[PDB]
Every structure is written in structure tokens, then in C-alpha cells.
Design an enzyme around this catalytic site. Structure first.
Site, mmCIF file in Angstrom:
data_model
loop_
_atom_site.group_PDB
_atom_site.id
_atom_site.type_symbol
_atom_site.label_atom_id
_atom_site.label_comp_id
_atom_site.label_asym_id
_atom_site.label_seq_id
_atom_site.Cartn_x
_atom_site.Cartn_y
_atom_site.Cartn_z
ATOM 1 C CE1 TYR D 93 -4.267 1.161 0.229
ATOM 2 C CE2 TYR D 93 -3.465 3.150 1.676
ATOM 3 C CZ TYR D 93 -4.327 2.426 0.926
ATOM 4 O OH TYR D 93 -5.678 3.406 0.831
ATOM 5 C CB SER D 189 1.301 -5.684 3.238
ATOM 6 O OG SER D 189 0.311 -4.402 3.613
ATOM 7 C CD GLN D 190 -2.124 -2.188 -2.568
ATOM 8 O OE1 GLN D 190 -2.968 -1.525 -2.429
ATOM 9 N NE2 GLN D 190 -1.109 -1.763 -2.971
ATOM 10 C CG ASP D 275 0.571 -7.936 10.872
ATOM 11 O OD1 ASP D 275 0.222 -6.601 10.801
ATOM 12 O OD2 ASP D 275 0.918 -8.121 9.586
ATOM 13 C CG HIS D 304 2.386 -5.055 8.661
ATOM 14 N ND1 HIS D 304 1.714 -6.105 8.005
ATOM 15 C CD2 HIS D 304 2.477 -4.337 7.369
ATOM 16 C CE1 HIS D 304 1.383 -5.932 6.956
ATOM 17 N NE2 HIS D 304 1.775 -4.888 6.432
#
Ligand SMILES: [Ca+2]
Ligand SMILES: [Ca+2]
Ligand SMILES: [Ca+2]
Ligand SMILES: [Ca+2]
Ligand SMILES: [Ca+2]
Ligand SMILES: [Ca+2]
Ligand SMILES: [Ca+2]
Ligand SMILES: [Ca+2]
Lengths: 325, 324, 325, 324, 325, 325
Positions: D93, D189-190, D275, D304
Site C-alpha cells: 500500500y 501485505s496489499q 501484526d 507487520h
């Protein structure tokens, strides 16, 4: 974000901002003290059953502002000397007299210690036992003590606290083992602001210990820091947008800078250059106007803790040398 | 850190914790109201000079707790109808009556609005003009109103506020254009807790609007959240380690859950499920014990703002249907 | 940390930083407005079924930037006067038109109120109903509106908003009960920056109310504060390290300071000296360059809330006096 | 405050919440892909002048959603082998394709690497060069990408990103030195949520690397954490209090958990149990429904960042074993 | 965000998690103490110059871990009794022995007080004078003391601290005025965890005071809170992802829960139910496994401050009753 | 709160504060290096089994400070050229050598890369494998590496690190495929401070890459920011109130500004003007005193990340132009 910083130390040492007080400052305090003196002091010392073995502890009651009964402790170290020097100790914001064993420092150094309970507080970090008694209506205020009765000096909370504190020295002086030539007034933070008032208003105090003083140079404190308790004033002014002139007029009667300009007894100050509760410029303003013989211990890297146990050492040395003459 | 969460909604809907109150709860309040009733209400409405054009604004003074003189505003919409419905509005923590133009909603919807100023506050987000008058000594307390007089219900700050608030409905009812069959008590957050008290204590109120109520289920509130103002109580108890039982006894007399069990008028509640100032478990405890006809609007994603302007629409539709 | 502080008030009152704009600033805006005027305004006012009793509410649709249809509310107080004065109200960042009952102040004071919905926002603190319609590709941007289309003034978000806002005044003026001699443009924070643009670009506005204005003195804002929404621009510049000159060139066409220098209508400003979202130096830069008759209300102790309900009172008094001349 | 915690690991390993999708989930994606396939892919690889010595860098352009031209990098390690395995890398992101030298890992391990630029982002932590092109009006939204077009799956931002992403694998496969039997889709993640979508929608991908995936189990994410970017959805819902059902219906078409139930290729997942951006219950929901052969690396003490460079070693070993 | 909460009190009172320790836990400690006992204790008490009047202050040096020379204070109240009871006081994280006047409580209550300086610390809130001496190489670690030598119990920092602490009781017992039937070991937070270890390892201690103990139930602590110092362990594990089993294996040898299961002397514990530094479940796990006669004071609304001065009163009363037999 | 800001850029560009060093600065370093040079370097390169295909990876061991064995990686890109240029890479605070694949940038650009592991760290953001070995006692310190042995420059942690770093360049130079005319010393943050020290102390380095350097202008750093790791020094000083002069005397021997005044090789610096970990005034002080040919890249909107991947491009271009003569 930016770490806290005030004026450079070279500027702090010369910082002498224009003082603001009303022309009846002295008359206000003369009348206040005269009114309270019409009530008998009626000091009461009662010895406590205690587990303490090196000190005798007394429950204290005396008449403060307008005869109102204020609590305290008297700790008397068990020593052969018949008359002992005495520290009158004032307490930081949201504190109270706690237990006798909370105040062992001065007695352990051979000083009688008179600890004055702070009216209406005693609920933040140490318990208290003394109520406040307001002048009739308790006006709109922001949570805390800083704006309690702020619209009139006659109704302002610290009028009552400072009067209590001047009377506390009288109550201490009435104890038969106290050497009246060696009575010290002492405090840090709110305690230091109270002690600074007493240094101008009392006739009995012989020396001042004033650490990281609060209640000093209000107009500058409010513009400099967003911390409590000075932020109580700011938050009140954010709402009561028509009351700015009145607020600072009232505060002028209680400002340590204005008391300092009248105090004549010997004083040891301390200051932390990273203190964002009691900013160094407010402390230096008071120190620089202080009219008695004076010294300041400067702690460049300390916040509101100041010199801690290092400063306690400085205070004991300072008083020993002073009272040797 | 961990994001705020209370009991799941399905548990909140059945949440009915054991109530604690003293035997003399009703007697305490009966005596309190009787003692204040011995002073004349002496309601005063003084038409003010205002730039407002659609509303007539009055300065209000009435006798609240023990004859003490409380300020307010009365806003009357300029309409042909001779008797109008009326909302008695209580104010959130650290607020006060402000200016007349701060309360234009209900008047704009055709309701007379009586705004009660909160004694001793008015210094946080909206100014106020009414002092508090303590029962003699003002005991050691933590900064704020939550612990002012907390060691004895007789001396407790909200004894005086709740008495003022009951008397405010009598003041409102004495205005000639108020339709006494359509008097509504209303508040959000501290105002909601005040209104909940009034719903049990007042004989004149006909409906309750109770948003995101504060002053509810104190024992749970203090364990659940570290936000102000409930943290004032926690901080007092951190210091006065010997006073826990006394503190919660006093608070039991002022707990919205105990008043809710006694209230009989129709009510519309609201709750924000992410509200960490007034947690959903404390609000549902009060709603679930509420003894009158009731509805609740649930806002799952909202914090202390609750339903905001959406809830305002729910309130207007609720009252219209009720009073038909 | 350090508490927020900008230039001292005495410096703020003389603060006139060197202005930066391109040589085609006026031509840019003339062409922009001329191109949007080629589409019919086609204002539509549709009476709504409302619970309001003292005010009539209308759903508004009008053509803004390049014929794009913008929503609004028109609130008309039920008064006997046949022509009433009017406030055109612009909305703060992340807000939208909400419900008609969100805007009852000005109608209650006897003014028609035209509330303009803000394209593409309406999702932060009050709901909105109007979309944005970009100039083709939506370039890489940081989350928010501040960097939407920032690489070219012709694609920048606020080109579309400011053109909507100039057309909003034409839409308000077209309502039959509006007195065209008493049309006021008003806003706080983003609304204040929108209103400041309209004061330079509109021919129909008669007075400006401009509280704690955003969109002013961007280069200073970005170096002074790390708060949103100015921090969107900073964050974009942290990544797009090659685009600094282009970013600030684009922003020069939308800077409230450059519009202020062209505005001629009477204006009442307000400023909070502790405002860290819209810093006082950015507000005073715009106020000091403002070329019409002007006054400023200064709130020394307020943050972004400014004067709140106190300033509302000042605004009503200001307009009453102005429109009696 | 309280430190972040999700379900205990024993519960996480059995966590299979009831799935929600519309009856036209497959048809929506079939129709989306068919519409974009009507435009020619037109992949362009343009060798760049670079200071890189061990790798050849190409500027990539290909047609993604509805023929819209997406940027990328192709990094080819200088090795004697004539056909090389390939990692198609999706970005986190607020990131973009950056510079070629930001993506040296896979090439250094002997893989061709295709980096897909993310439309409209590229302004947070790594620069991007690819614009978004909306379906006409850009509806009201909260700042960011999570609520861009959220009121209709056909206008929703990730519809265009996921389509780009499927087409990226077709673009990579068209490079002559790519071994089409060893094409890997990868993201964290994204990127991981994108990769998870591509694993259900693409016919060309042979293995999935899915680290700490975002875009999973939206209803739970929004209730569990107050961090960005999931908080963009929460904040939109706080304001648009009438749009809750519509928001979650839209999101159902883009949820990694629903794609996971359809994916058949071998996968290595990773998860950080602390996370608070991509919570472990959302990650395990997607892993547990994943329909292909699968393994997960669990990092109990990581937030994360996940397994970081330890995970990168796991991925290299996983793929070597798989392709033997 | 969510405010801190651990298990409900009714669950805390029954909380006995499964214990983990290695088969050689006892042998490890037997060997550690035997090796350090091969060096002479060589306790030195040096009367110092002090402003203290009710107490005699001594500079202390004694041999702790492997003959290494550890500092302390001995405070002896000036009382007629020829044998006095004694409190051996251990110090909280990042503290050190400071000045003699920092430890006046116990001497004021008629107890000799032996204050043990903490090797290598003394730089956070109170100064110290005693270095650490590592077992050769100082392995990669996270900033602080929690992960210093953590890959092997033989090299772990608290192996050396706990051995010093057991030897401190032997040093205290060697002072001629100390009544060896009334030796107390006392500490809060790190001091509590040290005292808990000593209660299992020392043969000379007669009673334990253990307030808000740190160094307990590490695996749970690291799951539950993100505060320092437990977070030093988490941060080490975040990076050294291959070392989890080794880290918790080492920590098992230093866990207060494992010592508590072996301790037989009478104890008074204290716990704050809102303590997010030393969570109540880690403290109750230790208390519930404690094998000697025991009581716990529970402070439901207190954080890491615990019972403060209230608990001090509880400790004095507890000891008075215990030593009346 | 106030957003971070240092001196304005025009002032930064001329900022040359008065330097403080002891008159034995050079003699201290000459003796330090001579004592360590008495141990053989004993460089060891062992090729690893690796999944890397474009680069050969070697495990490195060499003798740093007083013969102590320091780990590293050597990355040799697979190219036809027989001698390659080489970057000696130093690592940021709390980092270590990690895995070989963490350092692929320079090899991909055709440079041999020698990554030096940092003694005792390796536990914060990237794993490490090298212990520290103290000069006997490990004195009281604040958590971290900044105050480890700070009471004497002989015992100070960075004496050992800087000696390791000088020896790392010799170890690199010993690899047969390294072109000794094209050896570069490189680092960011702690790495930049180490590199700056090496640029004055090494005879083998040919160019310096110095990004957002740490370990510079300590007295100013400590006043300016409250961030870690500079706050470790402030925290130590808050407690050891008697040790200020000693602390800053020690630090003067390790200050990048004093090494910069002695360095003669060509340098490329970078600075982020919003960097609150390594403030721009500390970085510019070092840059401005730098005595060799120098350039600086200024990133006005970046915090501690500096120029990121943009700066990496600047470094490659800089070195290419330099080594073309
Ligand atoms: Ca006078
Ligand atoms: Ca009863
Ligand atoms: Ca009146
Ligand atoms: Ca022009
Ligand atoms: Ca279907
Ligand atoms: Ca055994
Ligand atoms: Ca000695
Ligand atoms: Ca020399």
C-alpha cells in the site's frame, strides 16, 4: 515533533521580564493576613502511636485562612539537643500530607519537620485529609485548582492556600522544641510557589528552599507549555474568551515573581533546563527578581524531577553553612 | 496497541449485570426532592435582545437544589400554534448554556427548548454562568466533578445537579406556551445520565431522549476504560486506597442503571459500539434495565459522537409518532 | 515535546512574505471560468418534505466545473420580508452538505443559506452526495485531496472546487427571494480558503467571512506543521523527490494569499494563535495581503476551533453594520 | 493501554468463519476479465541504460483493466540458462515500482522478476508512475484507496488493480526467456491480497508467495484494529451510516478469503502474530480456506514486518523444492 | 484504544499455569553458588561522613558472583537495642544504591537496612557504582539487561545478579549488630524478582517482602504487554527468529515462578491489578506457587506503583506480628 | 505539539560551531591503532553454499580491536573483470550483518561489498553474530551502546567499533579481486558516523559515502532532540548529575565533526532537513568541517530515511565520475 526548549541559559540568566501587578497588591495581602489573624491560631499537636522509632510523629491541626482548620504532620527526630532547627514543608500539586513516614528526610538530618496538608487536594499521588472551604459560590471552572475562583482574587483558591502556609510557620514556631532562629520554608513545584509566597508574607521564616517553582510568570507559562497544570488556565481561557484580562489580573496577585521582588531572606533555588511542567524561563524570572541573598542550582538535562537527591544534598550543605552564620 | 472493544453485540443485548443499591435509595431521593421543594421555584423568563429572527430567546433563572439559582435559556420558535411541545435539554461534561444560538435544533423543528446550565462547569467546550454551592467543606478530590463530594451521597456533586434537573422540568412547564402533555427530557453523554435520573425522579416528563449516556454502571466503567472523565474516579481510588467501598456506595445512588429500573416513560436511546468514553456495556446495562417502553439505535462503527445528525432525525421521527 | 508556537503577534501583524505566482495566474483563472460558463448553470431548487418548521429546505443541484452537477441545500427562514440576505456556506475538509438541519445558524438569524456540497469528500465528519469527475487519468497521489492532480494546475482538484464555488454564488443569486445586494460568502478552514478564492473570482459576492483559513501560504505551512491535511503535500514530496518545483508551481495558482491580493469586498477574518492545523502565519499572510476593507478577530488561546460561538456573534454584528451603510 | 492480541494460535489454526459472497461472484469476475481481454495486451519491454551490471533492466508497459496502460520493471539476471523461472511481484500500500535497483532479490536468486506498478498510488514509501482511470464519477470517499468507488463493485478501485494484476502474469509470460512452467506470483501485505486474487483468477501462475496479506476478511479487520488502512473503511462507515450493507456487499467481491476458497496452485503463506495492520485472524481465515497445497510460516513475536529476511530464505527454499 | 486488563481476579486467585524448567535447574544453582563460595565474602563496612543524625551510614563492599566486588549501603538506626532486625533491600530496574539518605524508611522503623547496588545498572532513576563483569564475550543483545547473555544460562546477566543477592544476605548477617533471627529480604518490581530468587537460594533469610515482582512467568509477560523492560525480550525475538526455544530455555532458570515453588519462608506479596509493567497474572502465578506461609495485598485500581505508602504500613505490621512468634 | 525544525537552510550552510577536542586526540587514536596492529589481521574468507546465482558470498572473519574476531560478509558479483572496485559497508544502530542477500545493491552495480558486523548489536532490526569484548568492568550504563564505558575514552564502546572499522578496510583490501585504488567506505546513520571516523583514521579508503550521519556534534544533538539513541546520553546525564564534563570529554574523541576536520578523501554526504534522529545541524557541522573534496545532497522534506533510493542513484553516479578521474 520538536523536543522542549526554552531560552538559552545565557539569556535565562539575564531574563527580567516587565512585572505586572495591581497598585493594591500589598494592601490585598495585608488585609487578607489581618482578617485571618483575628481568629486564634489554636495549634494542636497530638502524638501518634506509630511504628517509627527514630522520630516522634505528631498529628497537627491549626487555623489557616479565616480560622479554617488545616491538617499536618510534625516529625521530631529523637536527639539530645533541646532546641532543633525546623523545615516547614509544602506539598506538590494533587498531593497531601500522606503518612508521617513519607517525610523522613529532614528529621533524619536532625531537623524538626512541619508538613502542611494542602486544602482540597490530596487525591493525585499522595492522600490528603484537609478540605477546602470556598467563599460562597464556586464559580464555573475547568477541572483542577488553577481556575477555582479565578474571576476575583478575593475568591481565588491560592488566596486560601497561601494564607494557610503563612499560618503554618506560626504553628511550627509554637512547638516548644523548635529553634525560632532556624525555621526554614521549603517546597518543590506547587510547594516552591507556596514557599515563595511565604518568603514575602511571613515574618518568621529564616531561609527559603525553592525547587522547580510552579505559580510563576503565568502569562509566559501559558504561552510556552501545553502541559498540566498550567494548561488548566489555557483551557479556561479557550472557553471564556471574554475573561482574559480578568484572569491575568487575578493571577498577578499570586505570581511568584511579584512575591520574589519583596522577599529578603536567604534562598536556594533549583531549576531543570528541560522542565516542561515548570519552564526554566518562569523559574528564572522568579529567581532573577528575588530580592534576598540567593543561589541557584542548574540541572541542564533534568525535566521536572530537577536535581533529585543531588539537590537534597545541596540543601543540607546550604543550610549548615547559613546557620553557622 | 489494541483497538477498543467491549462485549459482542449479541451479549450486549442480554447484558443485565446484578444491580447494587442501598436499601434507602428511594428514601434518599424522596428526602432530597422534598427538602428542595420547600424553596419556591420562582422561575423567571426574561426576553433578551438578540439577532435571532425565527426564535424568541429568554434568559432563565429558577431555583434548583436547596433554592440555589440556576441559569438557562428558553428558545421559542415564532409559530402560530398557541401551545407547543418542549424539549428540556441537559448538557455534556465541561459544557454550559453557552449562547442562545447554540441550541437552534429543537426550535427549528417547532419545539420550545429549555436549556439547563450545569452548575460549576461551563469551562471546557462551551461557557457557563451558574456556580456550584457546596454542602460546607469541599473535601479532598481529584480534578473535576466526578469525585467532588464522593465520600458521602449527601455531599456528592450530582445530588445537586440531578435536583436542579428535576426542577428544570417544573420551570419549563410553568412557561405559558408549553404543552405539558408534550414535555421531553433530552441529553447526550453527561446530559443523558442527567436525563435518565430525571426520567425516574420527575412527575412532569413525558418522553426521554438518551444518547450515549454517562454516569452508568460505574464499577464496570472504571475497570473497562482509562479515558476521562471515568478515570477521575480511578485516579481518586489509586490514592485513597482505603475508600473503595465508600466510593462505590455513594456512586450507587447516582447510577443511571438504578434510575432506569424505576423509569416508566417512553425512551429512545442511542449507543456507539466503539465508544471508549461511555462504553457500550454501561449504556446497554442502563437500556436493558429501563422499565418504560423503549427503543435503541445502535451505531456499530461510531465512537462517542454516536449517531450524530442521523440520530437527530431518529429523535424527531420518534417524538412525532409518539405524540400522535 | 514542545508546545506549538508560530511568530509572535507583533510580527504576525507585519508579516508580508514575498508572494510567488506565475505570470499567467489571471489568464489561468479567466480561461477556467470562461470554459465552465459555456455550460448552462441550470440551477434546480426542489422543496423537500422536512420536519423543520421555522425554515423551508430545498435540495439544490447546479452546474459547477465544466457542467458537472453539484449538490447543495438552500434553507429559507419563514419571514415576512420578500427579499432576504444570503450566506453562501463552504464546508471544511472531509465534510459535505450533510442534512438541512446541520446548517440552522444563518437562517435563524434571518438569512437565506446556500450550503455547497464539496465534490468527492463527504466521508470524514459529515456525509456528502457529490462526486468528483477528474480530467482523465488520476495520477499517483498520497491519500486525500491535497495532492489529487497536483502535477498540473489544469488537473488539480481545487481547480474544480473553486469553479464550483464561484458558480454556487450564481446559483444562490438566481433564487427569487435572495437580495443580491446582500450576498455573503462564508467558510472556516477549507471553506475559508474556498471563500477567499471566490472573493477574488466572483462578481456577485458582497462580503467575505473567512475563519481560520486553509489553502494559504503552502510553502510555509509544509515547513511549520506536521498535521493533516498539509502533511499530505509533505508526504508526497518525501517520495516524489524530483517534483518539488512542479508541486509548488501548481499550488501557487490556488494559494489564498494570491487571491487575497486581488479581493476587494469587505471581509471579517478570524485566527487562533495556537492553531497547528492552519498556522497563524499562513492566515496572517492572507489577511495582510487582503486588498479589500478588512478586520480580524484574534483568539490567542484557541487552536483550530478559533473563536467558536463567540466569532459567530462577531460575524452577525459585522454584517448588520455593513449592510446598514 | 493494552498491547495487541488476536485469537490464540490453537484457535487461529482452526479459524474458518462463515464466508459471505454474492451468488454472482464468479460471473462478476468472468465478465470483468472477458471485457478487459477484448483489448490487446500489447506488452512492451524496453531495455534501459542502467548502472546495473549483474542484471538487465527493462521498462515495461502492458494493458491492464480495459486497455489502460500499466507500468512495470523487468529484471533479468545475466545467466547462461536460456529459460529462467519468474516471480511476478505485487507492491504494498502506497508504494509503486520505484527504481529497478529496488527489486534485486529475485534476480540475484536467478529468477526473472516482473514488478507491477500500482495504479494511482506510488506516493507513500516508494514512487510510482501509473495513474488510475475511474469509471466516470469519483464518488465521495475517505482519503486513500480502500473506499474509492466502494458503493458498487463495478466502480471499486481494486476491480481495476486485480485485473491489472492478472494481465501482469500474461505480460511476464510473453517475455521470451521466461519459463512458463515456473511463473510465481508474490506479494506482502496489499501485494499479498493482490497475489491471492491472482491465484484464483489467473490461468498462468504456478505458485503463490503470500506474506502478511491485506484485503482479507474485511468485516473482522474493521472490528479488530483501528490502524490504517483498514480504518479508512471504518471512518467512511462512521459518516455514511446508511451505507453499511452496501459497503460490505461490495467488499465481498474483493475479499482474499473468497479467492482463497477457489485457488488451486501451491502456496507458501506467512503471518506475524503481533501484526496489528493485517491481523492474524484475517490471515488465517484466508490460509485456512486456501484450496491448493499450502504451508504457512508463523512468526509469533513479529508485527507487520513478518518474517523479514528469514522468510525470504523460506521462500527460495520452498520454490526450489517445488520446481524439482 | 483499549485500556489494560488481565484475567479477572477470581481467575487470578486460581491461576497455576504449567511450569517449565529444565531437569538440572537445582544443579545449575547448586553449582553456581558453590563456585562463588570458593571466593572469600570479605565483607567491608566503612563508616562514612554524613549529614545524617538519626542513622549511622556505612559504605559496603562484599564479594558476590565469582569474587566480584559489589557495593552497598548499611544504615543503622541510633537505638539502644544491641541486636536489631535487618532488611536486605534490592533495587528496581535501572536503579542503583544512590545516596544513603534514599533508604531511610526501614532504619526509621528500627531496622538495619542493607541496600545492595545492582551490577551495571544505576543510570536510569537512581545512580549506581557497581560494574558488571561478563563471562568473556558480550553477545549480540537488545539495549538493556534482559537479553544480556540470554543464549546460555551460564552467561545470563541475572545469574550474576542473583548470586550477588544471595551473598548480600551473608554480608548483612556478618554485621555484629544484626539479629540473625530477624533478617528480611525485600524488593519491589526487579527487586521483588531478585528477592524471590533469594528466598529459594539463601539459607539465612527469615522473611520475604515481594512487591509487584518482575522476572516472573516470562512467556506470558511477553505475550501480554508491550511495555519495557519485558519488551526487550520480544524485540530480541523479533530479530533472532531462530532463537525462541533457546531464549525461553535460558529464562526458565531465572523465573520467579520456579523459585517460588521452592521457597519456604513466610512472605508478604503485593500486586496492582492495573499494572502493565508487571502484569497481575505473572505476579499471581508466582504467588500461587509460593511454597511458604504467605499473604498478598491486592490493589485493584493501582498500576506499577502498587500499594505505595499503604503497602509500607502493611509490611511493618506484617513483620512485627511475624517476629512476635 | 510543535513539529520538528532545526536552523534554516541558509544558516545550516554556514554552520561551523566551535570545535572541542582534547590536546591528545591524535595521540589517543595513534596509540589505539598501533596497539591493535600488534595482532595479526588474520583475514579469513570462506565461500558459502548459497542460493544466490549472480554473486559469490563469503563468510568473513578478521581481527579488529585488540585481536578480537569480527564477522562480516563479502559479496563478489560474477563478472569478467579481474579486479573490481569495493564498498566497505558499515551498519546502522541495532543492526548486524544479517544474511548475504540483505546487501545486494553494490554487487549488482558491479562492486565487491564487504559488510562489517557491529560488535554486540544485531538485535533490533537485522540479526548480528559478533560479540563485544569489554575492557574489564562494564560500568553502570543506560540501556544501549551510547553510554557503554562512557566515563573513559579508553573503555568507550565506539573505541572498539571504530578500530574494527579501520581494520575492516585492511581485510577488504586483502581480498585478491579487490582493486585497491577503488575502495569506498560507506554508511548511513551509525554507519555514516563510523565511516566518517574511518575517513580520518584509514590510509586505504579512497572515497566516503556518508548518509544522515549519527555520532556527530553530541552536545548539540542532546539539547536538540529527545529521540533515541542520542537520548541514551541525556538519560545517563539526568541520573549521573556529577559526570557531565567527563561524559562530554569522552565523547569529544569519537565526534564525527573532529574526524571530519582531519579527513582528506572525496566525500558524498546526504541530509534530511526533517530528520529528528540525526538533526541537520549535527550533519551540517560535520559536512562543513569536512576537509576533503565534498558534495552534499539535501532532502528538505525527508526525515531519517533521507534520500532513500534517490540517494543510492546519486552515489553510483558520484563514484563512476570520481573513478573515471
Ligand atoms: Ca500599594
Ligand atoms: Ca427503601
Ligand atoms: Ca437577565
Ligand atoms: Ca498575467
Ligand atoms: Ca454464480
Ligand atoms: Ca535435578
Ligand atoms: Ca569506602
Ligand atoms: Ca595532539
Amino acid at each position: 515533533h520538536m523536543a522542549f526548549f526554552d531560552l538559552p541559559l545565557e539569556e535565562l540568566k539575564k531574563y527580567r521580564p516587565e512585572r505586572y501587578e495591581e497598585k493594591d497588591f500589598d494592601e490585598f495581602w495585608e488585609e487578607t493576613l489581618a482578617e485571618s489573624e483575628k481568629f486564634p491560631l489554636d495549634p494542636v499537636f497530638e502524638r501518634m502511636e506509630s511504628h517509627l522509632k527514630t522520630v516522634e510523629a505528631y498529628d497537627v491541626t491549626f487555623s489557616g485562612y479565616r480560622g479554617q482548620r488545616i491538617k499536618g504532620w510534625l516529625l521530631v527526630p529523637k536527639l539530645e539537643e533541646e532546641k532543633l532547627p525546623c523545615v516547614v514543608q509544602y506539598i506538590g500539586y494533587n498531593g497531601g500530607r500522606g503518612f508521617p513516614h513519607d517525610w523522613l528526610f529532614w528529621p533524619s538530618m536532625g531537623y524538626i519537620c512541619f508538613v502542611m496538608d494542602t486544602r482540597g487536594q490530596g487525591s493525585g499521588w499522595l492522600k490528603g485529609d484537609t478540605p477546602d472551604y470556598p467563599e460562597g459560590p464556586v464559580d464555573p471552572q475547568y477541572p483542577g485548582f488553577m481556575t477555582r475562583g479565578i474571576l476575583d482574587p478575593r475568591t481565588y483558591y491560592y488566596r486560601r492556600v497561601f494564607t494557610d502556609a503563612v499560618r503554618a510557620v506560626e504553628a511550627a514556631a509554637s512547638f516548644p522544641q523548635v529553634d525560632q532562629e532556624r525555621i526554614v520554608i521549603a517546597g518543590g513545584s506547587q510547594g516552591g510557589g507556596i514557599a515563595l509566597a511565604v518568603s514575602a508574607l511571613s515574618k518568621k521564616a529564616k531561609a527559603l528552599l525553592c525547587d522547580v517553582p510552579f505559580l510563576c510568570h503565568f502569562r509566559r507559562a501559558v504561552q510556552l507549555v501545553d502541559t498540566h497544570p498550567y494548561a488548566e488556565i489555557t483551557n479556561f481561557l479557550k472557553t471564556h474568551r471574554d475573561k482574559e484580562e480578568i484572569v491575568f489580573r487575578t493571577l498577578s496577585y499570586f505570581d511568584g515573581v511579584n512575591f520574589a521582588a519583596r522577599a529578603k531572606i536567604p534562598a536556594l533555588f533549583s531549576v531543570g533546563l528541560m522542565d516542561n511542567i515548570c519552564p526554566p524561563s518562569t523559574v528564572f524570572a522568579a529567581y532573577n527578581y528575588y530580592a534576598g541573598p540567593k543561589e541557584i542550582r542548574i540541572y541542564p538535562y533534568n525535566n521536572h524531577e530537577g536535581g533529585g537527591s543531588f539537590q537534597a544534598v545541596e540543601q543540607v550543605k546550604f543550610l549548615k553553612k547559613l546557620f553557622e552564620k
